[PDB]
Design a protein around this ligand. Structure first.
Ligand SMILES: *[C@@]12=NC3=[C]C([C])=C([C])[C]=C3N([C][C]([O])[C]([O])[C]([O])[C]OP([O])([O])=O)C1=NC(=O)[N]C2=O
Ligand SMILES: *[C@@]12=NC3=[C]C([C])=C([C])[C]=C3N([C][C]([O])[C]([O])[C]([O])[C]OP([O])([O])=O)C1=NC(=O)[N]C2=O
Lengths: 125, 128
């Protein structure tokens, strides 16, 4: 119970709207969506009210150009909780066919947990 | 604690000895091998003296069963230094074909820290 784990997705851009075709349990736990509530969707489903449209634009462009991209973007869990998602996307090839691998980091949580350790270690003196 | 990128590897178990067909830069950085020195190999090439056969067994069994697995296993960089690899492998299906995807997290500093806190807890408790 309660751990920080990276989220990993693979999407298939040869399919309609570049859907997620693989997701790790880390991302299930990070976002609050079950595996089958993630698979088959475009990753944009995690965006919401305060997602910066300019950074969404910059992802779209990167993916169009098959350029690796890293960006911090506001994302939303199934229960509505906002989190900062540090997203790295890598274009890649498997069957001499292109896929995208995304690695997601819950920066909000990584900070929260590092501070708990920080504050604990203080309390020891 | 550890502050490095995670490694991702994809293998194709339909090819002989389940070779690596994709590796990200996170794993290049972590292992000290360039992509050209990784692709086409089996991931076991990162193992060495202190790699516990029990954990190798755990991985071998899960892949044979086509089931997810997580282990903490000792691996080695090209320069010979040992790192602790918290390794998660899932099967996956891409365009109706099966592959494995592996996620590698360097937990060497966390393990060092855990050991010290564990020792201190043991020591505190032995006292009054
Ligand atoms: C989602 N991560 C993610 C991972 C990969 C491998 C890829 C290809 C995309 C994402 N997205 C971005 C999203 O799918 C989309 O590409 C962008 O919104 C831009 O395109 P549109 O059509 O919307 O203009 C990710 N988006 C997220 O918000 N969070 C991530 O984890
Ligand atoms: C290697 N990671 C890794 C990633 C994937 C996707 C797969 C399928 C395997 C690995 N391995 C395990 C290794 O290749 C092998 O399966 C095991 O050694 C068990 O089989 P054998 O024949 O050797 O008994 C990984 N092994 C590692 O040591 N480090 C990883 O990062």
């Amino acid at each position: 119970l309660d751990h920080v784990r990276v989220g990993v997705v693979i999407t298939d851009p040869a399919l309609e709207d570049n859907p997620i075709v693989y997701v790790n349990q880390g991302f299930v736990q990070m976002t609050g969506y079950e595996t089958e509530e993630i698979l088959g969707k475009n990753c944009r489903f995690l965006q919401g009210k305060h997602t910066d449209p300019a950074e969404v634009d910059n992802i779209r462009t990167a993916l169009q150009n098959k350029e690796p991209v890293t960006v911090q973007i506001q994302n939303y869990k199934k229960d509505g909780t906002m989190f900062w998602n540090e997203l790295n996307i890598d274009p890649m090839e498997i069957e001499d066919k292109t896929y995208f691998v995304g690695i997601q980091n819950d920066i909000t949580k990584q900070k929260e947990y590092e501070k708990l350790l920080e504050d604990s270690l203080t309390e020891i003196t």
